[model samples]
Target: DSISPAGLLTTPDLTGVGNDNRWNGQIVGLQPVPGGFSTCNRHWNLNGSTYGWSSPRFADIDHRKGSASYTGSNATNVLQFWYANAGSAIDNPISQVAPDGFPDMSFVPFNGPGIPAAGWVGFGAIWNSNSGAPNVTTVQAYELGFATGAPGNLQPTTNTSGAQTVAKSIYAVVTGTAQNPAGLFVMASGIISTPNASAITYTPQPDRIVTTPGTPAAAPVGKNTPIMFASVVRRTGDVNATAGSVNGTQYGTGSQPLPVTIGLSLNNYSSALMPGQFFVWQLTFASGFMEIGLSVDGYFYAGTGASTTLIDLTELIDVRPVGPRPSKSTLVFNL
Candidate 1:
């Protein structure tokens, strides 16, 4: 009525790991749903009187003295019992002798593929909510083993009730790393059919690494050059002896004739305008004493003149210390 343990022996040295390494290099194993012992049967039909039973006793009992010597039999009753317990290991073969028209029982394993050792295992079950007769229950179990010893027995410590109990979707996750080696094989027992999926995640290490994308793909440009954007600006508002210019020049004595007072307004010009924007002004200087003055505050209209009077002074003006002229300038109001 149970499985033959010897039939489950695994192949070993064929993989050169040793005759005991039955798993070879396989990491997991799964048995199909309909093949495990944890299965259910709700398809049996009594067909009215065809599969009903009669008993001289009032309840289910083997025998009782002087109770009319209870006896019973019927086509439907025999068929119902036969089909109901057909898949059970305890009710197999000779247990429910196929009285009239019933077939022998066969066993198969259940299926669920790629079950990671630490993931989950699942199986299916049958539930019969419509039955009025006494309910039937099935308990399933599994065994995990290695080549060196007998398989370790695993008992499910918990059970749950549902509307109608049927077959089970069996599942078990490998929690420990010791049970999840690359060469382990699994053989599932209990109520089972065929497997749903394979339990392997295969890859080529060398080929995967070779195909990886290059990092920091190209080196960054790192040289530093002369800063072409450096610039300077200077200005002069008055040349009066009383109110001297920035260069200490006094106005009006013939010896120190005032020529021009160049001025500049640096408006952070390097960053203010982007390339191709408009910037306009004049660049020429005319006649002596008429004077050349520059200003950002220029007047396009006439007659708004500026004037600054001065007191007499006797200091000589030094001209040799002048620096380069500013890059740009414009004529502003005269003071």
Candidate 2:
């Protein structure tokens, strides 16, 4: 109340430059004004005749016809969100003491008018403009502690022809108590509309045609063959018997069903393989001649270049059987 720069100080690029309230000074026609409406240039004498403004603490003219047009007025402490250099330097301690200090509505003695006092809701109303038109679009409206119902529906830019223009851009969640003083009020008034051409564009669909034709080759092999074999490896034996030819004649006994060989052993102790280590091996043979060897440090062939190896089979491939003989084996090594 003592720092008189005349009184209603409102100059931080007063909305002009490319419009949209100069990029968000909002209030294009009035809509978002819910955190207890303060800036009527600032006033409030209380009983003697100076109430300047009091309705809008959360209005919503007709968001789809819900009503509660304009009702604000009880602001006993509305400073609402300020940053003051962020790092520290915040002088204006209520402008020295009060001459035109801005917000002190009326209640009686303290937390009574519009609630919210202590620490003054985030120190509202900040200023600093060296012709600050950098990005602009600064709309801010207030007044809202009650008059409920305006939380939704008026949003299509607050609509106009079909209805819905009671002032939008508000989204509150304040929770102050011990009498009041927490803040969460949003209001996005009118005045800021510009959209004629590129609202959004991207269209490209249709360029995938070849539906069939490219899988046909494998139809010859006739000389006297009796190939109808099937094989799956990974045997330990507690007796899951089916061993036709370990030496043939009747190895495990069935008639002549012995031709299965699968033994894998690879070791890694302590700590060595780091960057995503993995080892996988799989083999299937249905008609003879199938050999996959890896016994690490025992010598079957797999890990020799990087020391210690019986078999780390560096990516091998040999496919020649097919009926159910789909063979696929992948081995990745480390450690």
Candidate 3:
């Protein structure tokens, strides 16, 4: 009842059964290599023959492919693995070590291969099958770390000069994506570097901008943006001029002289006040100061064809500095 292949003079059906060379399930040998410990360059010696392999080298072998050779010789027929520095291997040697040190399943940083950089780590796994004729090696590498460079400098320039009452242009060159890739917080020194660092307050034209290379665009920023505030002021004022109004004195002294003008006009003149009955406004300035400060009050009167009575009264318009001035002026922020 034998149902095997027939041979020259073998049994009825079991002829080539004894000549079968099919390999069964056997590990033969297993070697675990540690990364970062020694160099990454190394090789494996099997059956007195050298095979190129690295510390993190991984391979696989299938029994259906072929059968493996096993002579029980640990040095000549067994799997031997070694890790060394460059030029230390007879076939394939590495010039650099792993990230951490040993290339085991442990976590290691992802360095450039030769030298390890900061903020990088990774891990690796290897698989081998010894149930076949030849050994099968398979390698699996993984990156398990992260790295980031330092924040690049954004050299900002301004055209702020003494006695200049015009809006100055403030911009800078931003590079790199390490910190604040979207945008960076802008800050300015409260005091000018001229006139022995005069304590002159100024508003940041643009508090933040996009870092999209080339010409930068306006971008919104948060309050917790990373920036250097050493000896600098973080301007958090509204850049929109027509947003609202405030009642306060914003003053700063400049090194040069700034000229300013104030004009007033009257409307709906229905004999309310004659040319002879005019109003007087005074402009006052401190000593050695070229700036002026003035306040005005408007009043309206309605007559009943006889006696006139007050109708509307406008709030006192304080001539506080609205923008930057030579002596002491206002600080308006823009972006």
Candidate 4:
């Protein structure tokens, strides 16, 4: 009866460095955990656990408690696609608590885990480091919630665009702690393997590539398909679309010193110092041009910058077919 829904990711009342708003308009997908949360760290090469773990809370998925916890800090700046589990029985009663953390046939996000979806799922709260301020055990069951499943045979899925181009993960930047005035939206982008020793830089065939649920058991990284991880993020913009172009004072390289950046926020410093360096992400481009949080007083406020705009025309190239223009993008973000 203690089981609750995934409560506020952090403090519900305060929307600061740690809260639920961090993922406001972002699309998040939690890759399934087939063998259980414990297996998250288990490797076929390192299997045969004399004492395995079982059900785990979402926020505690990185396993910060039991001996299974990592020897190093589990901090990560990039959006996580996989979450390990805390193998302590202390969380036993919590998993079975009341309102089913992940109720079946409910409105869980896409790729959410439930009955036949995944064995488990966890939406990461703010803090990037597992050993940071918030202790793992302090992770309120209500803070994240819990669920279980056996997801039959999950596979690649398409998005609103109909292409299998859905981002497996993302790590866009925000202007401030509130995460409101978000910066350009970015998604995980990386090749399967490294070292392009030959012409084989990325994954070859689809069969060899790794998917969410299962991918026909292939070789490990640097071998069969190296890694199915998204080790990168992306955002795109045209050359001449910026404030300096107001009348022809900003476009030509003459404008000089352009500190184009997507993360790190600034103070009284709106975007004027950087010319055409600001924009927002929208799910639709029907409005044309990217919103540049122009004239937002001090500018670069976390929640407002990405939502407001002054001159959308600056980001586009003579409106050439509107570039089919990305909104939420095809794994590529634009502001």
lDDT, residue 73, model 4: 37
Q: Evaluate residue 142 in candidate 3 and report its C-alpha lDDT on the 0 to 100 scale.
A: 22
- Per lDDT, the best of the predicted structures is 4
Model 3 off-target regions past 4 Å? Answer: 1-177, 180-182, 185-281, 284-335
Candidate 1 per-residue lDDT over residues 84-198, each given as its tens digit: 2111222222222111111111211222332112111112111232332211221112111101111122112101111100111233221211111011111211111112222
Cα lDDT tens digits, model 2, 1-335, are 22211111121111111111111221111111111111110111111111211121212111111122212343222322211111111222212211111122111111122322110011121112322221112223322111112223211111111221122112121311111111222222211111211111100000100001121111111211111111111121111322232422111000001111101111121122121221112222233222212111111111112221112111222222111111122121232
Q: Given candidate 4, what's the lDDT at residue 17?
A: 24
Q: What is the C-alpha lDDT of each candidate?
A: 0.16, 0.17, 0.16, 0.19
**RMSD, model 2, all Cα superposed?**
34.9
Off by over 4 Å in 4: 1-77, 85-335
Give the winner by lDDT: 1 or 4.
Answer: 4
Better of 2 and 3 by lDDT: 2
lDDT of 2: 0.17
A best-first ranking of the candidates according to their TM-score comes to 4, 2, 3, 1
lDDT of 3 at 107: 14
RMSD of each: 45.1, 34.9, 38.4, 22.2
Judge candidate 1 against the unseen true structure and give its global Cα lDDT, from 0 to 1: 0.16
What lDDT does model 4 reach?
0.19
Clashes of each: 66, 56, 30, 14
Q: How close is candidate 2 to the true structure, as a TM-score?
A: 0.13
* Deviation (Å) of 286 in candidate 2: 99
Report residue 202 deviation for candidate 1 (angstroms): 14
